[PDB]
Amino acid sequence: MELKDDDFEKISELGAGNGGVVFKVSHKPSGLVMARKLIHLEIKPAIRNQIIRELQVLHECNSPYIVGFYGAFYSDGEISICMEHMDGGSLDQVLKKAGRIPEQILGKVSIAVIKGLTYLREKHKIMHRDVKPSNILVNSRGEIKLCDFGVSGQLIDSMAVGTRSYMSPERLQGTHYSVQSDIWSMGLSLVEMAVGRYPIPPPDAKELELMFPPMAIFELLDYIVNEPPPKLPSGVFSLEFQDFVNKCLIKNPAERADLKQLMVHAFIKRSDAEEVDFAGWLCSTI
Numbered sequence: 001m002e003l004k005d006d007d008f009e010k011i012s013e014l015g016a017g018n019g020g021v022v023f024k025v026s027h028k029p030s031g032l033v034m035a036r037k038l039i040h041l042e043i044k045p046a047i048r049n050q051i052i053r054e055l056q057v058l059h060e061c062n063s064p065y066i067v068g069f070y071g072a073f074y075s076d077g078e079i080s081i082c083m084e085h086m087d088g089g090s091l092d093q094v095l096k097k098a099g100r101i102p103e104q105i106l107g108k109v110s111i112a113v114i115k116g117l118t119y120l121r122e123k124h125k126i127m128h129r130d131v132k133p134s135n136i137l138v139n140s141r142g143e144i145k146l147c148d149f150g151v152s153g154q155l156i157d158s159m160a161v162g163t164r165s166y167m168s169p170e171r172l173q174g175t176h177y178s179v180q181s182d183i184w185s186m187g188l189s190l191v192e193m194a195v196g197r198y199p200i201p202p203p204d205a206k207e208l209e210l211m212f213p214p215m216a217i218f219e220l221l222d223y224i225v226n227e228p229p230p231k232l233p234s235g236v237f238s239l240e241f242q243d244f245v246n247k248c249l250i251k252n253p254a255e256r257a258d259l260k261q262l263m264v265h266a267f268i269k270r271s272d273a274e275e276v277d278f279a280g281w282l283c284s285t286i
C-alpha cells in the first residue's frame with residue numbers, strides 16, 4: 001500500500017538531529033504505529049524523484065538487524081521515510097539513563113552491528129556511512145537494529161557536522177574512504193557506550209578512578225587524525241573486548257579489522273555463547 005501525508009497523524013515527537021526530525025505517527029488506514037522521519041530539502045522535482053526512487057530499495061532490506069521500512073514519499077519541502085517504530089529508542093538514549101552499558105550487553109550490540117553491516121554489504125553493496133549510538137535502535141523484544149544508513153546516493157549528495165565526529169581518520173582527511181570507515185565508527189561507539197561519554201579526548205587517570213571544556217572543532221579532528229586512537233581502559237574490561245575495539249580503531253583502514261575478521265573474533269565468539277536477557281536489561285534500564 002502507498003503512503004501519503006494525509007493518511008498520517010502525529011502521536012508525539014521522537015526527537016531530532018542535524019537535518020532530520022522524527023515523529024511517532026499513526027498510519028490511519030492500516031492502524032500501524034510508525035516512525036516517520038522528515039528531511040527538509042529545497043530541491044527540484046527531478047532529483048526529489050530520484051531520491052524517492054532510490055529509497056525504494058529499502059523495501060528489499062529485510063533483516064532482524066535492520067530497521068523495517070514501510071515506505072517513502074515527498075510532502076512539502078520534505079522527504080519522509082516511514083519505518084518501524086522502535087519502542088526502545090537509540091542506544092544514545094539508553095546510554096543517557098544507563099550511564100554505562102555492561103560489556104555483556106555491548107557484546108550483543110556488537111553482534112547486531114556486524115551482522116547488519118554485513119547484510120547491507122553482502123546483499124545490497126551498501127555501506128552504512130553513519131554508525132553511532134543514535135542510529136542503533138532497540139526495542140522491547142530485545143532486538144537491535146541499524147537505521148539511517150546510506151541507501152540513496154542522491155540523498156547523500158543533497159545533504160553535503162557538530163561537536164563530535166564518529167568519522168574515521170581517513171574520511172576526515174579526504175575522499176579516500178569506504179566500508180572500513182564503518183568499522184571505525186563502530187569501534188568508537190562501543191568505547192563511548194562502554195565508558196559513558198564520547199571517548200575523545202581520553203579520560204584522565206583521575207577521571208577513570210572516578211568512574212570506577214568541550215573541544216574546539218579543529219582541536220578534536222586534529223586529535224582523531226593525529227593522536228593515537230582511544231582504548232578501553234585496562235583492567236575492568238576483558239582482554240578480548242580490548243583487542244576487539246583495538247582492532248576496530250586501527251588508524252590505517254587496510255590494517256584495521258574487517259567484517260569477516262571481526263565476525264570470528266574471540267570477543268564475538270564469546271558473546272555469541274553468553275546467555276543475556278537483553279530485553280530484560282533494557283526495560284529495567286527504563
Ligand SMILES: Nc1ncnc2c1ncn2[C@@H]1O[C@H](COP(=O)(O)OP(=O)(O)NP(=O)(O)O)[C@@H](O)[C@H]1O
Nearest residue numbers: 014015016017018020021022035084085086090134
Ligand atoms: N525508527 C525509530 N524509532 C524510534 N525512534 C527513532 C527512530 N528513528 C529515530 N528515532 C529517534 O529520533 C532521534 C533523532 O533521530 P535523527 O533525526 O535520525 O538524528 P540523531 O540520530 O539523533 N542525531 P544525528 O544522526 O546527528 O542527526 C534518535 O536519537 C532516536 O531517538
Ligand SMILES: O=C(NOCCO)c1oc2ccncc2c1Nc1ccc(C2CC2)cc1F
Nearest residue numbers: 017018019020067081083148149150151152155
Ligand atoms: O537518517 C539519515 N540521516 O540522518 C540525519 C537526520 O537527522 C539518512 O541518511 C540517508 C542517506 C541515504 N539514504 C537514506 C538515508 C537516511 N535515512 C534512513 C535510511 C534508512 C532507513 C531504513 C528504513 C530504516 C531509514 C532512514 F531514515
Ligand SMILES: [Mg+2]
Nearest residue numbers: 017134135148
Ligand atoms: Mg540519525
